[PDB]
């Protein structure tokens, strides 16, 4: 029985700039840092940056849809999305679905997202306007 | 203030095989499924598989170290790692650090991991045997 996500490891090409991105801009808590990576936490999330020479800065058009989204409150959303744009963070997708979403890139091109809402709320929204061929699995 | 990981979206090239891998093999709860993806949950984790034609089946040597690790209890580790090997799931890295770790691949080549241990336990272990040039940022409360 799996109990959830243990940690998220991001391959980075430059450790010093990336540590600033997640600690300074995103306000994550930096717990440890060594010559090959760093340990940060964002609430219940264990984020690990690993220095990888195989890591190339990938433009969004040369990478697939794989992305990682962080939870943020409705009140704090607008100001935080402005913070990243004011800091020059690039956007790789426009929000069109339900709930607040801001799609941005990290220094190495990792596709990140700020999303307001939970899985329970997304399912409820999809019950009123479902996707093409969508089916729901309810256990009651 | 960010409150944690909201959801993890994995681009998949074939929706049906990927949905089976995470629901059947990994035992995750499938909540919804449509022509372009599926919603699954793993404890506090919101997992979303999204069908992306841009997704290419990537062998482990052509992708970087980026990986996603799932929590598992000490008791369940051994049997679960045996379950995956019995089903033919490929391994992309051998465990060398503290705690039980099994590195395996999903149908599309996404590097996954089963890990036993928390960040607090990993930090405590690194205080006795630290990594090269490692420094700790403790506030002492
Ligand atoms: O010969 C040596 N090789 N070596 C590698 C490391 C190292 N580099 N990155 C990680 C690392 C840490 N934490 C994590 C996590 Br959490 C993760 O997902 N990956 N990851 C890698 C490690 N490690 O824990 O062993 C340290 N010392 C040595 C020596 Br001495
Ligand atoms: O013209 C159309 N385009 N279109 C796209 C979708 C769609 N496909 N995947 C996702 C989707 C869902 N949830 C998620 C999550 Br959670 C995530 O991270 N990505 N993601 C994508 C969506 N969406 O509604 O956002 C549906 N209907 C339409 C129409 Br009608
Ligand atoms: Mn998303
Ligand atoms: Mn790992």
From TrEMBL, chain B:
Residues 4-117 form the VOC domain. The keyword DNA-binding does not apply. Keywords: Metal-binding, Zinc. InterPro entries: Glyas_Bleomycin-R_OHBP_Dase, Glyas_Fos-R_dOase_dom, GlyoxalaseI/FosfomycinResist, VOC_core. SUPFAM superfamilies: Glyoxalase/Bleomycin resistance protein/Dihydroxybiphenyl dioxygenase (SSF54593). One of its GO terms (molecular function) is metal ion binding. Zn(2+) binds at residues 7, 67, 98, 113. PANTHER family: GLYOXALASE DOMAIN-CONTAINING PROTEIN 5, GLYOXALASE FAMILY PROTEIN. This is Fosfomycin resistance protein. Mn(2+) binds at residues 7, 67, 113.
């Amino acid at each position: 029985m799996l109990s959830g996500l243990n940690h998220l490891t991001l391959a980075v090409s430059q450790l010093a700039p990336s540590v600033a991105f997640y600690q300074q801009l995103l306000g994550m808590t930096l717990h440890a840092r060594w010559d090959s990576g760093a340990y940060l936490s964002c609430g219940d999330l264990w984020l690990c940056l690993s220095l990888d020479p195989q890591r190339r800065v990938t433009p969004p058009e040369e990478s697939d849809y794989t992305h990682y989204a962080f939870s943020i409150s409705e009140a704090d959303f607008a100001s935080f999305a402005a913070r990243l744009e004011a800091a020059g963070v690039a956007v790789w997708k426009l929000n069109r679905s339900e709930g607040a979403s801001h799609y941005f890139l990290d220094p190495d091109g990792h596709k990140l997202e700020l999303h307001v809402g939970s899985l329970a709320q997304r399912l409820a929204a999809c019950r009123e306007q479902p996707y093409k061929g969508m089916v729901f699995f309810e256990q009651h």
